[PDB]
Amino acid sequence: LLKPPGSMLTHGSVPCDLIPKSSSLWIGNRFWSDITDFVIRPFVFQAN
Amino acid sequence: SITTPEQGTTVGGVIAEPSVQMSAAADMATGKSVDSEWEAFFSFHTSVNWSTSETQGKILFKQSLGPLLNPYLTHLAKLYVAWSGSIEVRFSISGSGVFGGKLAAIVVPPGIEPIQSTSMLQYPHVLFDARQVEPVIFTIPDLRSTLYHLMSDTDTTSLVIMIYNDLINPYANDSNSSGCIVTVETKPGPDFKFHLLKPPGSMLTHGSVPCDLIPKSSSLWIGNRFWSDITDFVIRPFVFQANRHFDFNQETAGWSTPRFRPITVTISQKEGEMLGIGVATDYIVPGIPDGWPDTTIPNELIPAGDYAITNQSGNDIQTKEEYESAMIISNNTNFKSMYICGSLQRAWGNKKVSNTAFITTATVKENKLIPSNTIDQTKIAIFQDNHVNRDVQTSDDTLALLGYTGIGEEAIGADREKVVRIGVLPEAGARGGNHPIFYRNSMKLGYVIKSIDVFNSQILHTSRQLSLNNYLLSPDSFAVYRIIDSNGSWFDIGIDSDGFSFVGVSSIGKLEFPLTASYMGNQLAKIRLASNIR
Amino acid sequence: PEQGTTVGGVIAEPSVQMSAAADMATGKSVDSEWEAFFSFHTSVNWSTSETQGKILFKQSLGPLLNPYLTHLAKLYVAWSGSIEVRFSISGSGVFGGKLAAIVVPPGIEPIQSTSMLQYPHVLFDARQVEPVIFTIPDLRSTLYHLMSDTDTTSLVIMIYNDLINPYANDSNSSGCIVTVETKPGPDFKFHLLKPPGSMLTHGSVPCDLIPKSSSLWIGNRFWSDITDFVIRPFVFQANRHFDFNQETAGWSTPRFRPITVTISQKEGEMLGIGVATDYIVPGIPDGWPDTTIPNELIPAGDYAITNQSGNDIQTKEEYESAMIISNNTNFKSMYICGSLQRAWGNKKVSNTAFITTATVKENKLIPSNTIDQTKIAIFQDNHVNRDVQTSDDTLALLGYTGIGEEAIGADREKVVRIGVLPEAGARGGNHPIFYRNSMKLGYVIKSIDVFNSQILHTSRQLSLNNYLLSPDSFAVYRIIDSNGSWFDIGIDSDGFSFVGVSSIGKLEFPLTASYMGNQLAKIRLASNIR
Amino acid sequence: SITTPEQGTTVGGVIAEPSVQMSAAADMATGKSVDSEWEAFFSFHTSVNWSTSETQGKILFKQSLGPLLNPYLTHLAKLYVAWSGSIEVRFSISGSGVFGGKLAAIVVPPGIEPIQSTSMLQYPHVLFDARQVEPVIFTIPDLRSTLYHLMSDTDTTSLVIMIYNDLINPYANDSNSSGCIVTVETKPGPDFKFHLLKPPGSMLTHGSVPCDLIPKSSSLWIGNRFWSDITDFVIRPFVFQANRHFDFNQETAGWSTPRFRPITVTISQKEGEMLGIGVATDYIVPGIPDGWPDTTIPNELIPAGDYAITNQSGNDIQTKEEYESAMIISNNTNFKSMYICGSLQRAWGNKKVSNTAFITTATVKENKLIPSNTIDQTKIAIFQDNHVNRDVQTSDDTLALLGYTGIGEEAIGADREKVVRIGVLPEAGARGGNHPIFYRNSMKLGYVIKSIDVFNSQILHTSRQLSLNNYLLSPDSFAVYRIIDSNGSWFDIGIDSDGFSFVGVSSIGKLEFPLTASYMGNQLAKIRLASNIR
Amino acid sequence: FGGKLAAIVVPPGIEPIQSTSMLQYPHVLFDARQVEPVIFTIPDLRSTLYHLMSDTDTTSLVIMIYNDLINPYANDSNSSGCIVTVETKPGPDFKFH
Amino acid sequence: PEQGTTVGGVIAEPSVQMSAAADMATGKSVDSEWEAFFSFHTSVN
Amino acid sequence: FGGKLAAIVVPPGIEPIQSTSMLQYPHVLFDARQVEPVIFTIPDLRST
Structure with missing residues (x-):
């Protein structure tokens, strides 16, 4: 059928589509400058 | 031999x-x-x-x-x-x-x-x-x-x-x-x-349909933080409340049974003056008495001042705001932001006449009363009729709830900094285009005459069910409930997977209060709850 | 193919x-x-x-x-x-x-x-x-x-x-x-x-936790055997308690082994923190006990009789006499480790003993149910001025310090927490339980009880394998003895065990435990008491 | 009347x-x-x-x-x-x-x-x-x-x-x-x-497939002479042992149980100093206290002598071997070959303070000890500082196998003259062309920072399972188990119908310890065991 | 009285254990009342053609108390308990060689 | 178009039975049930 | 090069494990030298 x-699927759509399938035009949320590098830490906090 | 049914x-x-x-x-x-x-x-x-x-x-x-x-x-x-x-x-x-x-x-x-x-x-x-x-x-x-x-x-x-x-x-x-x-x-x-x-x-392995929460009728509704019937709605961007609030999985950040009854606590007569810090007697929360109020004093205030002012009585409604003028003032009166409540005094050994009760939750180091936001069996103060230095101990018994101290037009529970958490901070932000609400109730005051109200998160009857029942809902589908006044106005309310109330209008207004509700089912919170109000 | x-x-x-x-x-x-x-x-x-x-x-x-x-x-x-x-x-x-x-x-x-x-x-x-x-x-x-x-x-x-x-x-x-x-x-x-x-996507068939033979039942608090039966309207303790999602507030692995940790010795005997050495929790001993101390206390010369010898069935009541007591001893809340010294300072003959969890201000201790890397203390003596310790370490629980009838495990205040404690109260008509367990006392031969959250060979399982269970129905296990009595335990997600009865009594100890897969928490658990 | 299947x-x-x-x-x-x-x-x-x-x-x-x-x-x-x-x-x-x-x-x-x-x-x-x-x-x-x-x-x-x-x-x-x-x-x-x-x-009247013995993974191996997991592999001409040892007939070579438990024994206050050993509360051998180590002392000596060691110490890793420095009296430590235990202490007669826990397996003669390769009821040993009174009994026993005493490079129980025989010490002379082996293990020292090895006869899981099930295996037949590491080195071990292990290699040492292991059934005893090293 | 006894034909190479699990095997229930004496056969399943006199490893049969023996007048001491006999007759298909 | 060998994964699907059934309980009848109904383009008054 | 690789059709409801044993199951080998690709099918084993 x-x-x-x-229409919206009452049970959510496939999440796979999120981020750009290419670095280049990534850029963050805290700021507009595109992503520079990747950092890892024990904990992650934010909200804005 | 055997035999079939x-x-x-x-x-x-x-x-x-x-x-x-x-x-x-x-x-x-x-x-x-x-x-x-x-x-x-x-x-x-x-x-x-x-x-x-x-x-x-x-x-x-x-x-x-x-x-x-x-x-x-x-x-x-x-x-x-x-x-x-x-x-x-x-x-x-x-x-x-x-x-x-x-x-x-x-x-x-x-x-x-x-x-x-x-x-x-x-x-x-x-x-x-x-x-x-x-x-x-x-x-x-x-x-x-x-x-x-x-x-x-x-x-x-x-x-x-x-x-x-x-x-x-x-x-x-x-x-x-x-x-x-x-x-x-x-x-x-x-x-x-x-x-x-x-x-x-027999008991069903899953859970009934959530279309059975709110009672179809505005009459018996009453707030969950206060036993008064609701009389209005609050269109807000954020909502927070743990006390007497229940989750959809029957869990509760709270510390009290979904009902309103008298609070019985035993406090050790300090011998000196007023004390506080009295552990409960029988509640389903180690220390923290079931029924004990919500917020705490918004400032390091002390216990004293008789009929401490907040000036001008008879000067009715020249009031509200920030004291309105020099002569006329809007808030002080020492034990401000205090929960008033009749109370029957114990007696231990002897000496009579109930007499007082003014409570809240904070640390009682010395004759001071600094406010704690984190609630533990060590922050339950009050006011009393201790007296006599034999150091007669373990005073009082019970006290209920009647009023609070006139902190201006502050509908209690409007700031995180004022709401007391046991550990976690249950809340909800604007999911989808929908906004969270409260339930403008009403709380009597004392020193003044009669006035001011307070919010509320779950219509009591709800929480009641939440705790006594067990349903099933999609963490992305509310519980569509229709509301209708006596004219034509009508709008929908939803229930968060956590247990909050949502609305699809940016602002709702005045409507004939002979209200009555209903239940529709569930709809992805990603859709607005239409309404024929305004 | x-x-x-x-x-x-x-x-x-x-x-x-x-x-x-x-x-x-x-x-x-x-x-x-x-x-x-x-x-x-x-x-x-x-x-x-x-x-x-x-x-x-x-x-x-x-x-x-x-x-x-x-x-x-x-x-x-x-x-x-x-x-x-x-x-x-x-x-x-x-x-x-x-x-x-x-x-x-x-x-x-x-x-x-x-x-x-x-x-x-x-x-x-x-x-x-x-x-x-x-x-x-x-x-x-x-x-x-x-x-x-x-x-x-x-x-x-x-x-x-x-x-x-x-x-x-x-x-x-x-x-x-x-x-x-x-x-x-x-x-x-x-x-x-x-x-x-292979791994079943949504857990396994939780029904193997509690072993079948009663003899193979150790406590999660002590390398000791179960032994019995206590029930309380309120339980807790995440010292070595696990969850169905393998998540645990504890700090120790199911296993029960020695406690290897360096030390600190200036020339004032006691003090010392040891810390960081073979653990999975930032600076916290993978075998460190629980209960701290009821009061402040400091060390004190030697032992404290509390009340003579030949103290039996005319005792155990608190102040059963004037030239009596059943408290003071100066370390009334110290776990008897398996004393053993390493070296570096070298000169031997050291066999310490006392090691609870508190603070170290000179000779002062003071309790706190908060377990910060800097709160693990010891008892010792180095003897030669400067420093270089890395001493003691390698110890192993043995006993506790003689006290009154207050079995260790019922005082939510005398319980060390890492941040949060596993709270569990009566769910409907069922009641939360505890696992009594004997524990060598440090004076009165053998004695005093100790509660445990979950059987040892239980957590071991939860600690590893992934199981399937709705946080609305506790898995059930049928326990029976050799006489004719029996009841049911219904481990609930959180990881505790429950019972629909109010209080069970003594019974023939050979115990066998089976299982009925699982039930909902909304109902009680029949049984054959008396 | 009846009930056909x-x-x-x-x-x-x-x-x-x-x-x-x-x-x-x-x-x-x-x-x-x-x-x-x-x-x-x-x-x-x-x-x-x-x-x-x-x-x-x-x-x-x-x-x-x-x-x-x-x-x-x-x-x-x-x-x-x-x-x-x-x-x-x-x-x-x-x-x-x-x-x-x-x-x-x-x-x-x-x-x-x-x-x-x-x-x-x-x-x-x-x-x-x-x-x-x-x-x-x-x-x-x-x-x-x-x-x-x-x-x-x-x-x-x-x-x-x-x-x-x-x-x-x-x-x-x-x-x-x-x-x-x-x-x-x-x-x-x-x-x-x-x-x-x-x-x-059910049990197969003709034994089950022996292949299942040891852990199909190094990591959790560990020995029988001691709990520390296997450290390395050593080969020698002959192999003797018995205590934590079992056989295919489940013959009780030793006197202990297949696992490790805190040795607990009561004793009498010798009224002197170092007191009298001999009791054996929790044991399945008349007297012989299950848990006692296969080691004793080599030279009769007195329990008296505090502070011995070599010299100053701190000049660690000082390649010793004697011949012939004069300063670090290497070897002697007054009373070496001891077994440091984490003891509880005494009790009964009251007043005390833990300590002690220095044992061996010799014999009590007041101030001397003197060894023996023969272990009988009255042969266990201990140490004290539990000052004499009227001479009360029933001690607070217990203690655990923790340390030994820094003799020298001697791996514990390297000689028959050290093995505490109970009745018959089972050895193992090469078979076919293969050579017996041993399981190297670590053991904490006493005076020194960290040190000394220990010879183990068979993996714990081995003794364990060997003392329960029943696997029929011909007399002159082994038990093929392939052990491997990571580099590529692979060899076999053929278990002996007496509880020993064999291999057909000259010498090995340097291998990525995180091993693994399986079983290829069982071959004769004569035929060697190929491998791959160097 | 009331109670039931179990009958099980254990194949060669295995030896029966005094546990319960033995019963999770095809069996034949047996009642204490049944006055009629039961008579079944222990069929010979064999590896070889003919059994050497000494072959101690052959088919086998055993009996285990399925359900306890109950008695309406319980109480103290070794209440009671009846005896059970066992006879033997060479099967028809049994012949030497 | 198809180049390469072919092998089974011991548990191959019995085509008909399943899929040749699902539809039933799917109401799904008109294969291309999107070429037998009118949609909606624009609408100007 | 040199190296074999195998694939397996895991049934719905289970999640594979990075272990060789997980291999014991009807699989399809594919030596690193293999040239002609291999075609197999992913059957629709469905509860619904």
Whole structure:
């Protein structure tokens, strides 16, 4: 059975589509400058 | 030997000689035929007002499959656990040969939720005219994944109606021109039959439908932080409350039974002056007494000052704000932001007359009273009639709740910094285009005369259920509840997977309070809860 | 499925003749001669003390019914079909009493209440020779289930008409036993084949935790054996407590080994923190105890009698006398480690002993149920001025410091926490329990109790394997002794054990524990007390 | 009256009826072949390493027929009496096109044991060039004298793979350059099927397959003389021990239990100083306290003498060996060869303070001790500082095996003159060509920072399982277990019918300790045990 | 009285254990009341053709108390307990060689 | 178009039975049930 | 190069484990030298 165009699946869609399938135009949220590097830490906090 | 659930040796009535063909005549008395007459006629469900000012494409019946539709079925379903088949739906409108317009019909398959857009129509549909006096009757066939539908399956086939073409009327002009109503009846499809017969009292492995929380009636509602009936709504961006608040998984960040009763605590007579810090006597939270208030003093204040001022009485309503002027002031009175409450004094050894009670939760180092936000068995202060230096100990008994100290127009519980957490901080931000609310209640004051109110998170009766029951809801689908005043205004409220109230309007206003509610089911929180308010 | 060439080894086997013969001389006839005979599951005796209506056998349809199916299940994933169940009744012809069975569909949990019979049921009686059997029909939504499925068309037996023993009325009369066998229904059949050592996406079938033999029951607080039975309206302690999601507030692995940690010695004997050395928690001993100290206290010369010798059954009451006491000793809350020194300072003869958890301000200690890397202390003596320690370490619990009747484990204040404590109170009509355990006292020979959150060989399992369970139903295990009493424990997600009874008494210690898969927390757990 | 196997009042159940379709037809979701997903594909019984070292001939794999081959068959036999039928085999080498070397396999008939010689090759075999890509499948017929062999039965029709043509690579230079990994996959024959079954939890009157002994992983190995996990591997001419030692007949070589528990013993206050040993509260040997170490003292000496060691110390790693420095009286420590324990202390008569815990196994003669290789009721030892009074008894016993006393480079119990015999010390003289071994272990020292080794006779898990089940193994027959590390080094250990381990190597040392281990059944005692080191 | 005894034919090469699990095997229930004496056979399943006189490894049969022996007048001491006999007759298909 | 060998994963699907059934319980009848119904483009008054 | 690789069709409901044993199951080898690709099928084993 088919779907009625532009409908929302009551059980969420495949999350796979998130981030850009290319670095280049990534850029963050705390700031507009595109991603520079990757850092790891014990804990991560933020909200804005 | 053994025996099946029916076998056994029969004997037949004694004087039941004559234990036969009697209902012969009785049958006539009611000229009834099939013992399933409901599985035949049509029962009303709901109806809506299709206005001529209602723009092309706009949902009207998000109604979904499931015996929850027809009341008879819904009732009967109480005895089974399994249902399958479809449900026929007859409904029509009373259009006048003058009008013109068309309505659309679409059978939305399971797993999808209809959007109030146009595109919905680029789907196989059935046009419908306003003139057609003949009431339409089609069926919502049950397409299923499983074999038999578990009572709670909220994910099934569904049908909906959308205004294909606006409603036109030859005598347009000003105001809400016009608009006729449309009804909708229901009859159990032929191929609809149950299946599993549950044994009375057995307990279902899952949980009932959440469409049974709010009581259909505004009357008995009453806040959960205070035993007063609600009298208003609060459109806010954030909400927070743990005390007497319950989760959907029956868990609670809180520290108290979903009910309001007197608070009994035993405090050790300090011998010196006022003390506080008295551990409870019998509560389901080690230390923290079940029933003990919510917030705490917003400043390092001390315990003293008789009828400490906050100036000008009789100077009624020259009040509110920031003391309004020099002479006239708005807040101080020493023990401000204190919970007032009658209280019966113990006596231990001796000495009488209850006398006081002024409480809150904070650290009582010395004759000071600094506020703690974190609540532990070490922050339960009060005021007393200790007296006599023999160091007579373990004073008082109980105290209830009556008022609070007039902190201006501060609807208690409006700031995190004021709400007391046991550890966690239960809350909710604006999920989807929806906004969170509270329930503007009402709390008497003292020194003044009578005034000010306070918020509230869950309509008491709710929490009550939450704790005593166990349901099932999608962490992304609210619990659609319809609210309606005495005019026409109506809007929907939802329930967060955590247990909060949401709204789809940016601001709601005044409405006749002879309110009453209802329940629809569940809808992805990603959609706004329509409403005909304002 | 078969990829690759194929070649003969000049001496290939003439299939038929051999194998198509062996069977003959093997009696082997019914290929699957294990699907045509009844096996034997459990066997609980029915007595007269049993009140009409108490469930005598609540089981759910699943491969956990018959052993074969059970040992065969480990190979597959799917299963559809029914399973037959035969019961053998044994009781003197003189007897009387009917037992009724019933088939509950999937989606409903069996209730001890008499209301059950308010559903089609059968009537079985004791005085019946030929045994009775019947299939447990498989009604299901799906097309087959994965071993994770616990809710299905389950069967149960309840006491209809009370068991009656004519000439009893006295000092013993007993009941009558009745077994339970099972045979894999014809309609039954397994399906998907599981890839060796595979992981079931949504947990396993939590039913192996509590070992079967009582002898193999150690506590999660002490390398010591269970021993018994305490119940409390409130429990806690995450010292070595695990969760179903493997997450634990504790700091120690299930295992119970020595405590290897460096030290600190200036020339004021005590003090010392040791810290960082072989752990999985930033600067925290993987074997460090729990309870700190009730008061502040400092070290104090030697031992403190508290009250002479020959102090028995005229004692244990607090101040049972004036030239008495049952408290003070100056280290009343110290765990007796397995003293052993390393070196660097070298010059030996050191065998320390006392090591609780608190603060170290000169000679002061003071308690705190907060476990910061800097709060682990010791008892010692180095003797040669400067420093260079790395001394003591390698120790191992032994005893505790003689105290009053306050068994260690009931004071939520004298419990060390890492941040959060595992809270668990009465859920409905069930009650939270604890596992009593003996512990060598440091003076009065052997004595004093100690509570434990969960059996050792339990957590071990939770600590590793992933299990399936709704935080709304606690898995159940059936415990029985060698006399005739028995009850049920219903481990709840959090990881605690519960009981529907109010207080059980002493009993024949040889204990065997089985399992009934799991139940909802909303109902109690029958039992046979007294 | 009676009750033939399976029959009796049948009834089905309430609304019970297993009516096919819903069962049977629920198969659709599979495509299932039969009731044997077994015979259909192959598994990985194991993989062998092939390097540019071994010379044309040496057999690489010498497995015998029996369910032990294919895992599912294996996992099923645990329910039957005997089997019959062949087993299809598929194997292939995972080499690189740059290699070069042929390999052949042959189906050796039951009753004979292959020989690492080319001639042995003249027989119907199957070549497999190193370049071969597509694997090859052949069959292992069930040539059987009997009608069927039950579980055990050693004389099965064995399979084998030896180096037909040396494997070389056009890159010499380095030592054991490299090589490729081979793999054998098994499939239950189409004519294989078990036969009569076993009654759950029964014991096979003719022993079970010994293959299951030691942990198929180093890590959690650990010995028997001590709890510390295995550190290294040492080889010696002869091997003697007995305490934490067991045998195939489960003969109690020693006196302790298969595991480790805190030695607990009561004693009498000798009224002197160092007190009298001898009691044995929790033990299964009249007197002999289970838990006491196989070591004693070599030279009769006094328990008196505080502070001895060598000299100052701090000048660690000072390659000693005596001959002939004068400053660090290396060796002597007044009273070495001791067993430091974490003791509890005494009690009963009251007043005290833990300490003590220095034991051995000699004899009490007031101020002297003097050893003995013979351990009887009154032979245990201890130490004290529990000042004499009226001489009360029942001590607070206990203590745990923790330390020893820095003698020298002597691995604990390296000599018979040290082993605490109880009755008969079981040794082990080389067999065939193989040499006995030992299990090196660590043990904390007393005066020094950290040090000294300890010789263990057999892995804990070994003694453990050896003292419970029953595995029948011929007298002059071993137990093939393949141990490996990471670099490529692989050898075998053939357990002796007396509880010892053997290997056919000259010497090994440097290996990536994170090992692993399996079992290839069991071969004679005479034939050596190939390997790969250096 | 009331009670049941079990009968099980243990194949060669295995030795019966005094545990319960033995019963999770095809068996034949047996009642204490049955006055009729039971008579079944222990069929010889063999590896070889003919059994060498000494072969101590052969088919076997055993009996285990399925359900305890109950008695309406319990109480103290070794209450009671009846005896059980066992006779033997060479099977028909049994012949030497 | 198809180049390469082919092998089974011992548990191959019995086409018909399943899929040749699902539809049933799917109402799914008109294969291309999107070429037998009218959609909706624009709508100007 | 040199190295074999195998693939397996894990049934719905279970999650593979990075271990060789997990290999014992109907799989498909593919030597590093393999040239002609291999085609197999992923059956629809479904509860629903």
